[PDB]
Design an enzyme around this catalytic site. Structure first.
Site, mmCIF file in Angstrom:
data_model
loop_
_atom_site.group_PDB
_atom_site.id
_atom_site.type_symbol
_atom_site.label_atom_id
_atom_site.label_comp_id
_atom_site.label_asym_id
_atom_site.label_seq_id
_atom_site.Cartn_x
_atom_site.Cartn_y
_atom_site.Cartn_z
ATOM 1 N N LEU A 121 3.197 1.947 -1.872
ATOM 2 C CA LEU A 121 3.464 2.334 -3.247
ATOM 3 C C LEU A 121 2.367 3.247 -3.770
ATOM 4 O O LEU A 121 1.194 3.123 -3.389
ATOM 5 C CB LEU A 121 3.595 1.093 -4.140
ATOM 6 C CG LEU A 121 4.611 0.041 -3.681
ATOM 7 C CD1 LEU A 121 4.754 -1.094 -4.679
ATOM 8 C CD2 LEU A 121 5.951 0.697 -3.442
ATOM 9 N N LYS A 125 0.817 -1.214 0.000
ATOM 10 C CA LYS A 125 0.000 0.000 0.000
ATOM 11 C C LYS A 125 0.859 1.277 0.000
ATOM 12 O O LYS A 125 0.405 2.364 -0.406
ATOM 13 C CB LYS A 125 -0.967 0.002 1.201
ATOM 14 C CG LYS A 125 -2.035 1.097 1.122
ATOM 15 C CD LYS A 125 -3.242 0.809 1.999
ATOM 16 C CE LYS A 125 -4.241 1.961 1.937
ATOM 17 N NZ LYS A 125 -3.574 3.285 2.151
ATOM 18 N N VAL A 146 -1.347 1.988 -5.301
ATOM 19 C CA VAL A 146 -1.906 0.904 -4.486
ATOM 20 C C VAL A 146 -2.579 1.441 -3.228
ATOM 21 O O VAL A 146 -1.941 2.101 -2.384
ATOM 22 C CB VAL A 146 -0.834 -0.114 -4.050
ATOM 23 C CG1 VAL A 146 -1.453 -1.181 -3.155
ATOM 24 C CG2 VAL A 146 -0.158 -0.755 -5.271
ATOM 25 N N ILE A 152 -13.119 -5.296 -32.072
ATOM 26 C CA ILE A 152 -14.158 -5.660 -31.114
ATOM 27 C C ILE A 152 -13.772 -5.086 -29.770
ATOM 28 O O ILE A 152 -12.791 -5.534 -29.151
ATOM 29 C CB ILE A 152 -14.354 -7.176 -30.946
ATOM 30 C CG1 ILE A 152 -14.842 -7.842 -32.246
ATOM 31 C CG2 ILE A 152 -15.340 -7.442 -29.826
ATOM 32 C CD1 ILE A 152 -15.059 -9.340 -32.107
ATOM 33 N N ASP A 203 0.741 1.839 -38.368
ATOM 34 C CA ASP A 203 0.037 3.110 -38.454
ATOM 35 C C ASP A 203 0.956 4.080 -39.163
ATOM 36 O O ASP A 203 2.176 4.039 -38.984
ATOM 37 C CB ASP A 203 -0.352 3.670 -37.076
ATOM 38 C CG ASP A 203 -1.310 2.763 -36.294
ATOM 39 O OD1 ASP A 203 -2.052 1.983 -36.936
ATOM 40 O OD2 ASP A 203 -1.321 2.855 -35.027
ATOM 41 N N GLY A 261 5.352 -4.244 -30.841
ATOM 42 C CA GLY A 261 4.008 -4.762 -31.005
ATOM 43 C C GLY A 261 3.349 -4.328 -32.306
ATOM 44 O O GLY A 261 2.327 -4.890 -32.696
ATOM 45 N N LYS A 299 -6.707 -7.373 -1.408
ATOM 46 C CA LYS A 299 -6.641 -8.467 -2.364
ATOM 47 C C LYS A 299 -5.276 -9.153 -2.290
ATOM 48 O O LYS A 299 -5.178 -10.376 -2.355
ATOM 49 C CB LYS A 299 -6.955 -7.959 -3.782
ATOM 50 C CG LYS A 299 -8.443 -7.708 -3.981
ATOM 51 C CD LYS A 299 -8.759 -6.850 -5.181
ATOM 52 C CE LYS A 299 -10.266 -6.866 -5.443
ATOM 53 N NZ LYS A 299 -10.789 -5.476 -5.309
ATOM 54 N N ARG A 339 13.391 3.683 -29.485
ATOM 55 C CA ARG A 339 14.119 3.664 -28.223
ATOM 56 C C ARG A 339 15.095 2.483 -28.133
ATOM 57 O O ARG A 339 15.915 2.428 -27.232
ATOM 58 C CB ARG A 339 13.138 3.633 -27.055
ATOM 59 C CG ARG A 339 12.110 4.740 -27.121
ATOM 60 C CD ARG A 339 11.604 5.117 -25.757
ATOM 61 N NE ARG A 339 11.096 3.967 -25.019
ATOM 62 C CZ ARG A 339 9.827 3.574 -25.039
ATOM 63 N NH1 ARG A 339 8.942 4.235 -25.770
ATOM 64 N NH2 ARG A 339 9.440 2.515 -24.336
ATOM 65 N N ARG A 368 4.652 -10.748 -31.254
ATOM 66 C CA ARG A 368 5.497 -9.587 -31.237
ATOM 67 C C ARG A 368 6.337 -9.577 -32.497
ATOM 68 O O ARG A 368 6.386 -10.573 -33.230
ATOM 69 C CB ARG A 368 6.327 -9.552 -29.961
ATOM 70 C CG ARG A 368 5.421 -9.244 -28.785
ATOM 71 C CD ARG A 368 6.167 -8.847 -27.560
ATOM 72 N NE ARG A 368 6.933 -7.621 -27.731
ATOM 73 C CZ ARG A 368 6.422 -6.408 -27.572
ATOM 74 N NH1 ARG A 368 5.136 -6.286 -27.285
ATOM 75 N NH2 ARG A 368 7.190 -5.325 -27.713
HETATM 76 NA NA NA Z 1 -10.274 -5.474 -29.440
HETATM 77 NA NA NA Z 2 -1.960 4.686 -0.641
#
Ligand code: NA
Ligand code: NA
Length: 327
Positions: A56, A54, A59, A100, A248, A183, A66, A177, A143
């Site tokens: 961090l 927490k 978080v 989709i 793109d 991707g 959890k 980079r 990839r």
């Molecule tokens: Na999609």
């Molecule tokens: Na916090």
DNA sequence: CCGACGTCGCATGAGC
DNA sequence: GCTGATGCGA
DNA sequence: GTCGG
């Protein structure tokens, strides 16, 4: 930091993230979970309690809980349940088809369409983009190794120049980079004849050429400034054929080009730092322009930019190579 | 407590 | 037909 | 869900 450190946790959080995005249609919860996953993935200690975590940024209370549950039991009840839920796991899955999104996936599963098989039986309910995403479902989740990216760059720069030698093109993204894999391929494009205060075919001609030599194989979307589509390296004789890849190409005004290049080079974290900087030096930077504030905070006219370095100069940073733009 | 959380080009739907 | 909201992807 | 005004 190894995966084996907190991998179970970051996987859990990333799973949760995807259900928020695709099933619950809660895009901010999605990014909150990814943010937590990311900050945790960088933290170089095996986490022992949700309280440790927490601390961090990103978080909070509910993820701390959890983590405790996961740590004690080796799973999360809610996640186990949703994983087994036929309807929701199917909605989450269909969104892996490009085109989709959560709304279309919702609709499909509503009328019984739950699998790639079901999609293939119902092509006349798929729009153009969706059909392309179906066709190349597997290729797209692969990839691209940097060696292929180089070969794709070669073709892109060669064909762009051949159309008109005054065009300028840059392959950006994690590729620029120095990444060992990518991707998709993001190309930024400009021409001296296209400025802000300024044919609508500068983009068309380039795409047309890349189609004509059979590099570009399909079109997801295309207009006067942004092209999104599919491409594929030429098959090396009798060898296995390359995957289809996403590419793109966007046209950008010459006076907004390097702001575009800087921004689409990233990384995201580097971009936030640099735009944070930046503000504290009296300037506002977006994808397009750099502008000065403003004692009251009123941004003035965009400042002339003619290189990436120019932007660094404006905010007294030392130009940093794309290689060192990790953050 | 409660709003921000990036933004935008393009395809396609919906409303007129 | 035109306009402009929505879904989608980045 | 998390942060912060
Ligand atoms: Na999609
Ligand atoms: Na916090």
């Amino acid at each position: 930091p190894q995966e084996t450190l907190n991998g179970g946790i970051t996987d859990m959080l990333t799973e949760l993230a995807n259900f928020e995005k695709n099933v619950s249609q809660a895009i901010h919860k999605y990014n909150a979970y990814r943010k937590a996953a990311s900050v945790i993935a960088k933290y170089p200690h095996k986490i022992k309690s949700g309280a440790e975590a927490k601390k961090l940024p990103g978080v909070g209370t509910k993820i701390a809980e959890k983590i405790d549950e996961f740590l004690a039991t080796g799973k999360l009840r809610k996640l186990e349940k949703i994983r087994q839920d036929d309807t929701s796991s199917s909605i989450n899955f269909l969104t892996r088809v490009s085109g989709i999104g959560p709304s279309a996936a919702r609709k499909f599963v509503d009328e019984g369409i739950k699998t790639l098989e079901d999609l293939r039986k119902n092509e006349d309910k798929l729009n153009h983009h969706q059909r392309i995403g179906l066709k190349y479902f597997g290729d797209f989740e692969k990839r691209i190794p940097r060696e292929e990216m180089l070969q794709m760059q070669d073709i892109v720069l060669n064909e762009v120049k051949k159309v008109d030698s005054e065009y300028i093109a840059t392959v950006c993204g994690s590729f620029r980079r120095g990444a060992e894999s990518s991707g998709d391929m993001d190309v930024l494009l400009t021409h001296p004849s296209f400025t802000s205060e300024s044919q609508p075919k500068l983009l068309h001609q380039v795409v047309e050429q890349l189609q004509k030599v059979h590099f570009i194989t399909d079109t997801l979307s295309k207009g006067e400034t942004k092209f999104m589509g599919v491409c594929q390296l030429p098959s090396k004789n009798d060898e296995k054929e390359y995957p289809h890849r996403r590419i793109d190409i966007r046209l950008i005004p010459k006076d907004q080009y390097y702001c575009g290049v800087l921004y689409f080079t990233g990384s995201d974290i580097f971009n936030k730092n640099m735009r944070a900087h930046a503000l504290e030096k009296g300037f506002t930077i977006n994808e397009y322009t750099i502008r000065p504030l403003g004692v009251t905070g009123v941004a003035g006219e965009p400042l002339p930019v003619d290189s990436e370095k120019d932007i660094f100069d404006y905010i007294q940073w030392k130009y940093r190579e794309p290689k060192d733009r990790s953050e």
